[PDB]
Design a protein around this nucleic acid. Sequence first.
RNA 1: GCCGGGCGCGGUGGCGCGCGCCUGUAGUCCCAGCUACUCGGGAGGCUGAGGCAGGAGGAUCGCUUCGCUAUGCC
Length: 88
Amino acid sequence: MVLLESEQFLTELTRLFQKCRTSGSVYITLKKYDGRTKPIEPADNKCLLRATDGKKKISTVVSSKEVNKFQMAYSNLLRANMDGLKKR
RNA sequence: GCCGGGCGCGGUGGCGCGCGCCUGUAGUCCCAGCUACUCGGGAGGCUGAGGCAGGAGGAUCGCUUCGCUAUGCC
């Protein structure tokens, strides 16, 4: 798939959230990433996040050296783009 | 040989396909065409892949529920 870095991944996730506003759903999947590139070397410090809407899909890999920078930005992006609920 | 799958709607005689919904792998991009006919063509990555039968777990399709008694010639 379209594998991008965190900087472009967040921007494209923003576009997905905006495009799935009036019609469409946003699918976000998080899973521990081993690092394999060939069918069954195995790394234990990677995580994989895939964002799709049915038509366009993007994927990203976050490691230890970038977890600290990516966590806050991802949480802020979710807070900004996941509005539209009841406030009780 | 493999590189998503399924549900409903729609088009086509048919394939490819468009829309909405749900759900995966470490593992896809582009161009719209093939012309009575079961995946049209191009460019990339992989060695294991395909089919059958059971089991638990998601969104959905079809069914549903007249007696008692009280103050008293104090």
